[PDB]
Design a protein around this nucleic acid. Sequence first.
DNA 1: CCGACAGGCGCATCAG
DNA 2: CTGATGCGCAT
DNA 3: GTCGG
Length: 326
Amino acid sequence: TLNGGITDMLTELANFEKNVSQAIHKYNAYRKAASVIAKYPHKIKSGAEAKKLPGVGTKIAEKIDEFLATGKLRKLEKIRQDDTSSSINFLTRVSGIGPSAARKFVDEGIKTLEDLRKNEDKLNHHQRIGLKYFGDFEKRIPREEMLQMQDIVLNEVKKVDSEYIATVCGSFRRGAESSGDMDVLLTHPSFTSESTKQPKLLHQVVEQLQKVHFITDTLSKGETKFMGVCQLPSKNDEKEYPHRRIDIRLIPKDQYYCGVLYFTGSDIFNKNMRAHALEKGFTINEYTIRPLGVTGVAGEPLPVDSEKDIFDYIQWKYREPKDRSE
DNA sequence: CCGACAGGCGCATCAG
DNA sequence: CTGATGCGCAT
DNA sequence: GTCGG
Ligand SMILES: [Mg+2]
Ligand SMILES: [Mg+2]
Ligand SMILES: [Mg+2]
Ligand SMILES: [Mg+2]
Ligand SMILES: [Mg+2]
Ligand SMILES: [Mg+2]
Ligand code: NA
């Protein structure tokens, strides 16, 4: 809430640039700026003060001065009053509808939940499920519910094979009091970077979670990434729990630490860390950290035995998961 | 200035 | 069909 | 939209 007006303004501009303008680097620029400002431990008194922060430049500083003086931004007032911009922005809130499809839909006269719900024939699988659970997917998940979900996933995984290790990542691993969805990092010894010695390792877990009615729908499903929907069991005469988004990522066992770093985030933290790695001459993904050659082609994976090792390579002091949040 | 901006999975689409 | 591209998504 | 060389 310190500088919350400013960070809200910048987040709104980010979403506009992503959803309406389709300018992913401007979106990221506004998000980077929002993040550094959120971290800044002083009440910002001018745009020039803000501009000293990395990621805040001339145009954001001028917007900040406007906001400080008036309590609003004309650019955003205008955006808020434009039906077409608002409609496109709205439709992107449905899982599976991004900026491109949102624009195409609004151009075809589809601009409301009502319009989506009578035009389901125009929606792909992912989008149909996103619409079905539109309200539920907007709701956050209390940590208490995350803990019940974790208990279910870890116990069902164990029933399939005691050699699986499932780790709940994302905001949950960062200590958050509520989470947007559940993210599960999965490993099994027969899946490494050197061999897949058993097939269907992810499939058997997904199937077991479906069998016990925890997983209720599938948005997408490959050999290493599952994206879908789950729901806690509720008791007699109690309202149902909201359906929840779940992501499962099966990662090579020997690459657990790059995997857990990726899947713990936050998203902005990973972008900042990965960008820092590049400046240091390395590239990081969910599998490995590799050095960069002169043309920017990656070399051989470096040895990693801990999350901290990755930080060490790029000369960052270790940040515990709880300090990787926005 | 100005090229770079994080990385990649699953899925759809198009050219051939 | 394969291969290249882009979308929408994950952190 | 912002930054590092
Ligand atoms: Mg600055
Ligand atoms: Mg969407
Ligand atoms: Mg999450
Ligand atoms: Mg997720
Ligand atoms: Mg599928
Ligand atoms: Mg997220
Ligand atoms: Na790799």
